[model samples]
Every structure is written in structure tokens, then in C-alpha cells.
Target: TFEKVYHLKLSIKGITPQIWRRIQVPENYTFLDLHKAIQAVMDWEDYHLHEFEMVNPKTGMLDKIGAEGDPLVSEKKAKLSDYFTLENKEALYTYDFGDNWQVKVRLEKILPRKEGVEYPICTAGKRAAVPEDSGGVWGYEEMLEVLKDSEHEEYEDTVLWLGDDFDPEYFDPKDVSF
Candidate 1:
């Protein structure tokens, strides 16, 4: 069981009806755990690289966490508590370099653990994440427009790629299997 948890509100930077999630993660969790939680909360498949960066408390400089080969600190080794303190609340998490999905993560509160609760769980959210590799938000927007017009030349391809069941406005917090 967790001793304490960090309540976070994460939202996509661009696009209207912003895709967002309210989640709680364990205080002792590593940056990688936070990343995976975000991925699950946002319903992403996690097939690409990602990075987390926040302001360093002592040095007043950026502290970055990512995969092992990169120049940044490894997410595997960086504890979220080290940089994401109560005062140091805001950070950026970007996934899929080509899609450039930038998420604004804010520590809304620090909470004492409750009974029979799982850490890193999503409590609320809005909308669905853009389909992976759909060429970013701009392309997704274009695809939406095309999907609405049955006569549009790209409608068939968009339907084939995204399928008829894709719902941009759909999200169920409990659907997150974190």
C-alpha cells in the first residue's frame, strides 16, 4: 500500500475539448511510473519515446527524465518526488516525437493514502486521445472534418484507418486499466 499520493491534472496542450485526465500516483513512484500512468489514463498504446521535465528546486534549472540512451536522466532512476515536490508542481510530458503530444502535468494536491485503493488510478477525464500516428492534432482535425462528409475523397481512407467506432468525445475513467 502507498503512504501518500500525488493528485495530478494532465491535459493536452493544443486542440479544443482538450483531452485530459485526473489521476493519483504514489509518492514513491519513479518518473517512469508516472509516464506509464499517464499513458494508461490517456488510453495511449505507448509505442514511442517520451520525456518528462520540471524545474529543479535547488538549481532553478530544468531536470529531464527519459529513456536510457538519451542525454537526460533516466526515468527508471529518477523518482517523481525528487523534482515534483509540493511547491514544484508543474511539468511537461511529451510522447510520440512525431505526434508531439505535449501534456501539461500539475500536482494539484498531496494526499494521504486511503484504504483499499490502488495508486496511479484515473478518477476523471475528458475526450479520447488522438489516434496514434494520425499525424498530430492538425491531421486529426482534418480527418474529423473528412469523416463528417461522406462525399469527401478522404472519408473512406479515414474510416478504414480510424474505423467507424472511433469516438473523439468518448472517455470513461474506469476504462483506464492502470
Candidate 2:
């Protein structure tokens, strides 16, 4: 149903194994739609504030979209096409202010939409996202180290907390329910 599609590279900032995704979103989609797509793609529960900011490197100007009460423009009223362009290809998407999960979003390509395909689809991805509120990247790294050794003092607690099925290396684009 879309006339055009935006191909994007989304990567979690400041993390190892670089949890990332290659996704395609409809050109007409709202910033909020992109936010939800990201949450689904990243397997994150939507329970936090989020913002999208487009910064101009040359002029140091910014265009933003977020919730109504915040300083940024309302995501509800802004379409992805409003800010995403070849010249303005990169932006920052920050989710969960306290945990501060920041994603570097780069617009990789713009193409005509194909028939019989869903927009906001995840084409590729790598590595599992850290458990939400796992004390950010540093804490998640520490937790991984602790989980590796059964003799480690915090191993049992972490195992119980993360569950027996949690896999740090797990990633499947088809699993994304966008």
C-alpha cells in the first residue's frame, strides 16, 4: 500500500556484538510508527519514553519528534519522510531515558515499494538485545561475564533472573512481529 520505502540501518550505540537491524519502513509512516517498529524489531517491551532527533552536522540545527509533553516536536504529527532524506540520513533514537538505550538510525536507501509486501519489515539483524533495565550496557556486560562461570558468585542469581532460555547471540529477523 505504500508508494515508497525507506531502508534503514539501526544499531544500538556503545555495545559489543553491535545489536543491529536492517529494516524497511513505509515512507508515509509516522515517527511513532517507526518507534513501534523499532521496539518490535529489537524485542523490547514498550514501557518508556522515546525520541527521534535529526541533527545537521554543518549547521548544528535539530529536528525532533517525541511525546507531546517533552521539548521535541510531537511524533504523532510527524511523518518519517518529514525528516529522513539523503542529505539528512543519520539520526538518533533514544528509548528509556533512565536505561538510555540509544540507537543510531541511518537512512541507507529509498526505493519504490514492492507489491504484496508488508512495510516496516525487518530484513536482517544481529545479536540479542540486553534485558531491559539490566543496568545499561556496562551492567549487561558484567552480567554476561558472571553468567559465563558457574563458580561466579552472581551466576545463579543472574541465571534465575535472565531465565534458562535467554541467549545473548540470538537474532532472527523473521521473529520480529512488525
Candidate 3:
């Protein structure tokens, strides 16, 4: 038995010097709910499919909870507490198969519910998430290089594609929404 909240840390894979976010979610939340929580903190637009895949350390087996209607792997049915525990604490959350943004989901700790504090709130994080549809980390890296050098041939194009508000090092816990 655990507390009413789960402390989770999400770090996106593939991006060099990956960014990480720390959040607290309800203990009873399902995989779908956790996905939404990840979305809010990472500032990701949930426009594509996503799934949580956990590998059992004991037997080297896999458990996948997808964000769809299939009953066998429905994200809405798998409770976070049931699958993520101290022993089995890590999962790979892949979003948007096109970009294949893989988020390393870690069950960092468990904590009691704080009175008046909203659940599923971001407590800490560094850097903003990579832009959507940026051709994965490789493209993101290229985009960053272009952005760094305004004279780069692709700077104008990358700027036009990525907008002016993106700050790779910008992240405030207060910006997270439920």
C-alpha cells in the first residue's frame, strides 16, 4: 500500500542532453491519465497516438497500455499504481509514431496527498520539450544548430517553421496545466 500521490519524472530520450520534468499525479490515475499529465508538463500537443510500455524485470516480459479502444491494451484500464511500483518502476512512453518521441517514465517516489495542492502538477523541470514534427531528435539537433547561427542557410526556414517563442532552456513549474 502507498500514499495518495505518485511522484513521477519524465525524461525524453534521443535528444542530446535530454530534458526532464518532475510531476505529482494521483495514485488512482490510469495510463491515459498519466499520458495527459505528461502532455501538460512537456507542453506536447496530443495529436497522435501514444502508449506506455513496461518491461518486467523479473521475467523480461513486456506490458503495453495503448491510448485506444482495444480492451486488451486500453490505456484507460491500466491503473498507474498497479503496473508502476518500486520494483517495476520504469516505462517507455512513445508518442507520435511519426516522430517517435520516446519519453522515459520513471516512478520516482510515492507521497501523501497535500491538502489544497492540485494533483498532476509539475513541480520541477529543465528546458522545454522539442517542437512537434521536428523530424525527431536528429532534426531537432539540426534546428538548434541553425537557430544558434542566424547566418546559417537554414536559419530563416527553421525560424519560420519553429516560431520565435521556443526557448530550449525555458521551463517553469507554474506553466503546467491539469
Each candidate structure's TM-score, on Cα atoms with residue i matched to residue i, is 0.93, 0.93, 0.92
The 10-residue segment with the lowest total lDDT in model 1:
63-72
Tens-digit lDDT track of model 3 for 1-178:
3358988889989776768999988899988898898888878889888888887554467977886663246788778877778888899999989888999999888878988887778889988788788888888888988899989988999888988787888888998887
What tens digits encode model 2's per-residue C-alpha lDDT throughout 10-113? Answer: 99998887989999999999888889988988888988888988874454689777887844778888777877889889989999889888999999999999
Off by over 4 Å in 3: 1-3, 56-60
lDDT of each: 0.86, 0.87, 0.84
lDDT assessment of candidate 2:
0.87
- Which portions of model 2 miss their true places by more than 4 Å? 56-60
TM-score of 3: 0.92
Error of 2 at 155 (Å): 0.7
RMSD of 3: 2.2
Give the better candidate number (1 or 3) by lDDT.
1
